[PDB]
Amino acid sequence: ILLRPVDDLELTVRSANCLKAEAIHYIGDLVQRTEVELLKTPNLGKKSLTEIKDVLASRGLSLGMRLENWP
Amino acid sequence: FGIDMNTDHTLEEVGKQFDVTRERIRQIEAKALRKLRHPSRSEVLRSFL
DNA sequence: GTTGGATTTATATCATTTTACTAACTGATAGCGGAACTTTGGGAGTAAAAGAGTCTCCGCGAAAATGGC
DNA sequence: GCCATTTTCGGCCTCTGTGAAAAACTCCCAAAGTTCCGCTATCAGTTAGTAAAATGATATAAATCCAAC
């Protein structure tokens, strides 16, 4: 799952633009950045963070987890 | 597209049934087709082709 | 013990990005209707006289339900 | 009551493929079919615009709290 475009996430265009601001290209990139790091962003506010974390929990992989030897 | 109804409709009839015009209905349909073209809600319908 | 500045929470207002709803252009495409033209489809007609059907087949038997006397 | 002519039946499965005769033309008229062109409806594709909602960012006001005197 960690190898799919952030496009395949069904998020509001505001969130997609904000994620392109930090050059997040694929998923998994989004998960190795915590909530406080993400929120310090132009236009990536509260409701967008709740939406992104709820969609992440639908994926089941909330923000924060670490893995090995990526990539 | 006339699903669960007795007839099919153009965008004039859909526009008259609501409070809405030609281009508005055309782009709500466009938005629906982009929403359903997303891979998340299309794997089930792919098997029907 | 204290107390006041500051370092945070609390509430509200402002700016930016996006949504919801317009119109105009572009380009095509299908559908319907009319005019002309070629093809198809139905009908009438033929004036030496010509003036009684097929039809091959026909290698079946036992029993019962029918007329006719 | 008795001939004497009709009528009615005769096991189950499985494969199997049929083209195989037969002799008229001619003229006139109406309607269907084919094709082309023009008008009209209907939709995809794209762009730009305007008002409003949504959302985030900043501002403004206090709570209290912690350190220094």
From Swiss-Prot, chain A:
Annotated region Alpha C-terminal domain (alpha-CTD): the residues are: 1-71
Q: How does it assemble?
A: Homodimer. The RNAP catalytic core consists of 2 alpha, 1 beta, 1 beta' and 1 omega subunit. When a sigma factor is associated with the core the holoenzyme is formed, which can initiate transcription.
Q: What does this protein do?
A: DNA-dependent RNA polymerase catalyzes the transcription of DNA into RNA using the four ribonucleoside triphosphates as substrates.
Q: Which family does it belong to?
A: Belongs to the RNA polymerase alpha chain family.
Q: What is known of its domains?
A: The N-terminal domain is essential for RNAP assembly and basal transcription, whereas the C-terminal domain is involved in interaction with transcriptional regulators and with upstream promoter elements.
Protein name in the entry: DNA-directed RNA polymerase subunit alpha
Q: Which residues of the full protein are shown?
A: 253 to 323 of 330
